[model samples]
Target: NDNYQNNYVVGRGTVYFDRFQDGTNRKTGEMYFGNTPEFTINTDSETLDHYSSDHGMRVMDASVLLEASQGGTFTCDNINADNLALWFLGEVSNTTQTQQTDAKEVFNPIMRGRYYQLGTTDDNPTGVRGVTNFQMVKADASIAISVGSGDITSIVGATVVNPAGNYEIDLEAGRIYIEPDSTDLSGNVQIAVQYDVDAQKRTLVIGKSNMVYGALRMISDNPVGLNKNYYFPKVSIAPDGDYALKGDDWQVMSFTFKAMQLNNITQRVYIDIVE
Candidate 1:
């Protein structure tokens, strides 16, 4: 046989083993954290409890949830080898959590830019027009992202969960959550972008564009109620009250904003606004 050199496979989502200890799984059809299983995460056992002091995810190998984000092609940047494994918090009182891990060393999160504008447009209004959408998004998941301290970013279909009614004081943070639309958490969970700017090497920085997303109230019975509208879907002075039609200031915000996921990405993280 001729000695033709063999090629090596590279990039994200690559595996060469099977389930547990050191091999891939015969079941998940692959050998990766995003794929097959090892011990079958125990929910009540604190093993699968995402908040347990010892809660940790054990990937059979490396992993991937969606078939599309697989192979190599990505939107913004490549997954960081550092954040390759699921990120969770430890030491803290479980009261707060952050995304930090070693897998990030193995993967490289691509850098990308995204924007958000309030209200919906003419096309794909149903999905972007409202907040109570039951659709499951695969792209940039933008849910109710709250940065606490009354700071928030409202993005459409950005993967929001915890569908508890009533204007929330804290809709929670992070890119993960189980919501009304489905069981799986959405948003930043999907696309995570990481970029390192080399100031010295580059001659100049480039400017890019982003999209805007948000919610809008349907035209009232008057279609243009009072020729003006209320101040907010979530009012400040009025907790369980309605807006008053006192004066020009009486008319308020009838619509809100929601950001959508942008195509062509390796990874990205978008924060959402809370009520």
Candidate 2:
């Protein structure tokens, strides 16, 4: 009961993590490209200019982070990048590395072609611009998946047509394993947003009863997907009408807590805003 309240989301503390997450290497094969996907950016930084320097470098949504052996420790937050772990590195190589089945064992220190966030790093992303049409996704890349796709079938936002496992990261707050890519560590795990502004029409009203068990599954704290149970007579957003929009400052959002009420899992929320 640390208590929480900022824009308003009484879902308790609001910041607490641990489901485990380490790092890098070994998703072996599929479409290991050194380049070939049509690139562009010209502003977020340099390199990969002209939009087509022969072609090479176009993998978007890349920011898979999870390191916890100590040190500063990095867990995954920033509007909760969705547990991030996205990858598209030069694609892959070593003769496609036997089309590796996502081995495992890297606990940290990763930097393939590159894909980071918060510190930003888009070098050149047009979404697998070319590389023969781009295609590098190796699931169980060492564990830490399962939060949004429940049972496979996701491309994370679009254009990621199968491969990278669709992305997942959220252990209800306690779990992270993944041998680091290929088989070996024998961990295999994964569990696991929107806004607007400018003219400013911001509004947040996500309400849920103080629950801890009863329904089996029903919750919503605001990934903007709202609804996990706790109708409690009414209220998930009623600041006037509900159908929000408007953003300007780094505005990003994601909040999830599946399966509620039972031994009483728990789920509660409340966010009210008007600016």
* Best of the candidates, TM-score: 2
Task: List runs of model 2 lying over 4 Å from the truth.
Answer: 1-14, 17-246, 254-275
CA lDDT for candidate 1 = 0.21
Predicted candidate 2 versus true structure: per-residue lDDT over 1-275, tens digit per residue: 58754453323112322221113212222211121111111112223223433557653423433421111111112421112211101111111111112112112233232231110113212111111111222334434533242223342321212323232222221112222342322233221111111121212222323221111111334443322222111111101112123656332222222221212332222233323
Q: How close is candidate 2 to the true structure, as a TM-score?
A: 0.15
Question: How does residue 254 of candidate 2 score in lDDT?
Answer: 27
Q: lDDT score, residue 192, model 1?
A: 20
Per-residue accuracy of model 1 over 84-122 as CA lDDT, tens digit each: 211110011111112222111000121222222212223
